[PDB]
Symmetry: C2
Subunit: 305 residues, 2 copies
């Protein structure tokens, strides 16, 4: 298994379950509270580490207590935290989350130290990025840093995997550097300009990304699975049926487990089944990282399948 | 100045300024983040301590890091934290707060350790409550504990001051034990059944509370000040004109400073002017406790007045 380098955000998730979302000017008392480490960068770094990858993590926390704790935690999640910088005078990223009695949620985010992951910091990681087999990134880090990291990778035979979340348009210069992209429907549309409701739309949107030069395109479709497309040839790959309790980080787990499988040189079809198994498990648990399953659990799930 | 005993909640306030309140299923990135110690019990305990009172604080924090920090903090706010218990296996109370670009806010609360402040814990404080000159309470603690604390006070010549917030109806058994009550309009209506929009309504609502046996009734009216009523005789007392930046804890500061003034045996009219000065200062600053002014600042404000 080649080495993986994840570059992305780190958040401390504060989750409060409550009857209903407070209206403007209102105060509501919740029924359950949970602090769990989150952030797409870390969720994916953890999903990969736990699933068995040889991964190093480029990220930034602040100089606060919470920052030290998450750092303490990630180190035990089978992740090399040597590339995680501490930014003096800044707060560690945070996410305030409400979940109502109807199962819906709303999230408020503070970028904090995450906005400090600069091109200068990426350059300082030139060698690490150069020697890795693949680089996994999202969009909760400055675009200029993601851009600069992708170039170094493109220059040194480092596979570039991008989870284009949260949704936003991207320059062709960055897309022309991506090898594996994993957008959901909203993101696929935002990236191609094509609304994706059905498999016909997904194939069309996929085609647009392929023309940008992206070899592998996986569009998460929600309940019906993912549209897996390699160089124009795609098909819908169903996920597992499970009773969801908390879907947060489901997509991040999918991404982290997927890359682990691919860097293990498993064929795409099996890799996707592996990532789907991991995600299926993740939605049956609460909190982002606390729900990310380890390799043993993933394989056990598969074996009983 | 006689001794003051505050019994109430302790919260860690997580405040995020953002463009607009996220809609169901949405994620929004904020522009400013602040962690400040809050909770009506602590806000009032701090407002009193800083304003110069000889105050001891009965409360509960969890056995987490945040709990230790707030405890470390309150000790420097001129408060005797000897009566603050640590509850094993429980989280310190928390408040998740959003403030949009229009200045509005919504608050989500986790009771945490605060729900553990029991009658047994109050009884353990029988002597402390007995020897104090006054007891200041709110409604973010179990009603049975507030009830039991009020009885001990009633039995030992301890003045009972109640800030009936958040709004909720209360049994006549508790009201018949209150000496000073400080409801806002919503709370006054909730307590008497009389809608309070104007000074005529306020006087009527005040009358209802007086009949419950409460000698001093102060109904905060919002912009026009407070309806100060002693045994049926009331009048509107205007507050100071100021440009508000953050009104949270304004009412708690008013309460804490007010009691300090009264326990200093200042006449009600002056006591109310003192509390108003403190609150006026509080709304020009961000965060709950971080905005509570110290005695020197309050007197300076008054002198320049």
């Amino acid at each position: 298994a080649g080495s993986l380098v994840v570059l992305g955000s780190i958040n401390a998730d504060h989750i409060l379950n409550l009857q209903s979302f407070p209206t403007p000017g209102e105060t509501v008392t919740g029924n359950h509270y949970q602090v769990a480490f989150g952030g797409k960068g870390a969720n994916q770094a953890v999903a990969a580490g736990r699933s068995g990858a040889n991964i190093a993590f480029i990220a930034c926390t602040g100089d606060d207590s919470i920052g030290e704790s998450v750092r303490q935690q990630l180190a035990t999640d089978n992740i090399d935290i040597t590339p995680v910088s501490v930014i003096k005078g800044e707060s560690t990223g945070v996410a305030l989350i409400f979940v109502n009695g109807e199962g819906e949620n709303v999230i408020g985010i503070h970028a904090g130290a995450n906005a400090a992951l600069s091109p200068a910091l990426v350059e300082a990681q030139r060698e690490r990025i150069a020697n890795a087999s693949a680089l996994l990134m999202q969009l909760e880090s400055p675009l200029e840093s993601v851009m600069a990291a992708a170039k170094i990778a493109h220059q040194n035979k480092t596979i570039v995997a991008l989870n284009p979340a949260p949704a936003r348009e991207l320059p062709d210069e960055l897309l022309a550097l991506v090898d594996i992209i994993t957008p959901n429907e909203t993101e696929a549309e935002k990236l191609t300009g094509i609304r994706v409701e059905n498999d016909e739309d997904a194939a069309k949107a996929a085609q647009v990304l392929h023309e940008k030069g992206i070899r592998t395109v996986l569009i998460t479709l929600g309940s019906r699975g993912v549209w897996a497309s390699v160089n124009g040839e795609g098909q819908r790959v169903p996920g597992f049926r499970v009773q969801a309790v908390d879907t947060i980080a489901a997509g991040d787990t999918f991404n982290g487990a997927l890359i682990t499988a691919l860097l293990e040189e498993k064929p795409l079809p099996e890799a996707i089944r592996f990532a789907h198994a991991a995600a299926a498990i993740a939605v049956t648990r609460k909190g982002a990282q606390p729900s990310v399953p380890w390799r043993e659990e993933i394989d056990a799930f598969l074996d009983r399948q």
